[PDB]
Design a binder for this molecule. Sequence first.
Ligand SMILES: Nc1ncnc2c1ncn2[C@@H]1O[C@H](COP(=O)(O)OP(=O)(O)NP(=O)(O)O)[C@@H](O)[C@H]1O
Lengths: 752, 144
Amino acid sequence: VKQYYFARRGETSTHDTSLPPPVKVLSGRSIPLKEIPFEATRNELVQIYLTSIDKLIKSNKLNSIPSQQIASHYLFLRSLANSETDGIKKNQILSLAKPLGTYLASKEPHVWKMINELIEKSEYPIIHYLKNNRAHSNFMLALIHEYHKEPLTKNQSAFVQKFRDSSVFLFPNPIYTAWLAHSYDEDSSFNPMFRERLSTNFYHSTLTDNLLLRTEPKEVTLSSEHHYKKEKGPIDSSFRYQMSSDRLLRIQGRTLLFSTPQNDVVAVKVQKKGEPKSTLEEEFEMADYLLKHQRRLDVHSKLPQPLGQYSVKKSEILEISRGSLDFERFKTLIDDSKDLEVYVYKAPQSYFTYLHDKNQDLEDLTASVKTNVHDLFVLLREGIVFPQLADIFHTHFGEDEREDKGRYQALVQLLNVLQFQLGRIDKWQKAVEYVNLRSSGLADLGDSLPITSLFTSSDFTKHYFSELLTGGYHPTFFDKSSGTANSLFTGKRRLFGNYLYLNTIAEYLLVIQLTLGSYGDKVTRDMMDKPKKEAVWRELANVMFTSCAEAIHIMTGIPQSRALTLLKQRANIEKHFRQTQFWMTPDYSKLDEDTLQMEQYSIYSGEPEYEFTDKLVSGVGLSVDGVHQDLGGYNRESPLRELEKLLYATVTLIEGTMQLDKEFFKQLEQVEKILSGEIKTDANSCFEAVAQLLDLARPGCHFQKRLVLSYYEEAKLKYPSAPTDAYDSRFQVVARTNAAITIQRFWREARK
Amino acid sequence: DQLTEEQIAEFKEAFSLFDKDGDGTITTKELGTVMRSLGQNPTEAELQDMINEVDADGNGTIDFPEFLTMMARKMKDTDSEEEIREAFRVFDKDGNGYISAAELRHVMTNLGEKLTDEEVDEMIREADIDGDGQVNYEEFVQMM
Ligand SMILES: Nc1ncnc2c1ncn2[C@@H]1O[C@H](COP(=O)(O)OP(=O)(O)NP(=O)(O)O)[C@@H](O)[C@H]1O
């Protein structure tokens, strides 16, 4: 009864084995591609910053810039000092940083006293100062361009052209990580957005890019007991089901439903057009597997029980199904061959109701979406990927010819070159009309793809995201001198494995949103009750945000309550509720240009109103064809903006928490090897190592700080008469909070 | 009685982090560490006793339900009124044995798992404390 998953998360060197040839051909011309070392080039930029610091202090013109730039410079230098373990470099940087303190302490006492407050809190005191819109000023890059009176290197110049947004992008690994997990808590008034001469520049993608281009290349391994290695013997089925048309309920696609005495359903699946026996034996083995180990993974779904898989003569199937209304579509869906393979299973009725059926009340849907989101992600961790929930297609003009194969990517900013905004969905109302989410749980499992295959060059990965594994070519990137392609993109080749892990999660939650989005519109269509209209929409917005909170709780292991808070900072639920209400209904199709503009501004409070030049269709809205509605104009972004914002806040949370906690383990294994008696230095070095250990704790979490508290007490006991001036205040707070918790826990007794 | 939902939520996060390979099974070689995180003051003797009792097979993988039960075996009795009194006296600056009402309110509101004002005002009023009086935390723990 041991609940343990058969996956194993580990680390390899590099994925770069059996890739596409790193060459692009254009009009017969073979251009190769080369990598910029991201780590190296940034480190070079850091060092150039430091020589620029030196140049300015030599200039004696510290009056030239506002006080806030100076303060930022001081706090960054002290943080860079503590983050480095190079002793000679540490002495160099502190010698550089001291004259700034000499100025600020003397001249402006107000701000200086604010900084000295922040210096005692945390020995990464940059992260606590850049937790608001003070970030949106790029102090490092401005200063470089100010004082770097040398021709720039090409690699660096290319780097800062991609990451021009912030100054935060030039911190070394530990500091950046801590900031990008600490900019989510209740303290943070951060918003990844800034205005500049009536041009809004978002970058809620660039943060995710810049975190992942640091992490070690993930690698999965399945254990021996796993399905996708266990060479299980063939399905021994002698059981046959004598079928009678008298008991037929209905027909759907290539499935026939028949009533049981137990109120359950016995279903017959016939093979598809060109689908061989391979899929049908796979689906059977899947279902047998996921009922054998339902106790292990504690998958909450009522999952279908298989019964038989064999061949039948076509004549009998054609004879029996003839009674129903939809016989023409069922006749065309089956193959022309007279020997047809079947697959039978037994399920509760709620298996054949599509999640987006309008006959359900709200609570039933709430606990049904919850069940389905949990069962998806619990399965994912195990090692099973579902690629084929819904056929969300971008377009059908370029389908085959283009790279992405018309397949919607949820993270289209990450996986391409110079693609920023999330793309227009097409004919969505139908695009999830046969979605796999059912009110009883997960369904249609035969299309499963081992997570291992998301990291290799399998049929799938080679098929769809070619231009990830190939390497980025763009007109401007072409250097005539080298004759090869330089980019910060190409280096994604070694680290594509991670980008396809987060694309899985982000596409899953987009299926969930479109489904809840379709349900809402379908039920609200026949309504006159505008307060009730918002009452339905608000309920489906909340269910969305509970859904992402169950995602993060299963992946990374934050409690859901805190995780919801850490989300509801970023994507302001009210905006997301309203955007949906508007952009999914045929109601706005009955408006004029002025009323539309007024509705647009009211709904996109701070951000600019949505620009489009399409002609609306009555009863439909925006349509390329003229019958089915879309989401967004022609060749423009999604009108569901705050949905993109929520999607990036989901990923950057999952990666930016696992990465941080890989950082904390590095520091603990450091500090313990100090304390034990292997690595021997003094009190100051010991205290610093404990001070860094506290600063790499999870956001707004308690126990982690409680652990470090224990180490500090052990450290202070070891060094008897060591000065305690610097590190009394921080641990004092941590001590007080440990006390407060104990008191509050004991109080939980006002019962009976 | 059994453990509360808060304790489930704390023991989860901690054990889910310390799963260095995120599989769902922590190694016994490091069990002693994570126990300190959950507010235990362990000795090597009891650690070795838990190693033998659970891992007599020799696998060295500890799962969530086992971890909760073993922690419950530890949490049978470790703390008392004295442990609560010491946790109260870290606010008691002068060793008089009394605490202020306004400071107690502040810390109960500001830190940890934020309380509501209605619950903390109940904590003061039902403790029979004068509004302009000092709170005998020793007598308060004796009353609770
Ligand atoms: N998954 C996606 N597939 C395609 N385009 C997308 C996708 N996601 C976003 N886009 C948007 O596609 C826009 C560019 O239009 P796109 O159709 O890709 O190229 P084009 O220059 O118009 N020529 P073409 O590709 O031949 O049709 C960008 O503004 C992107 O925001």
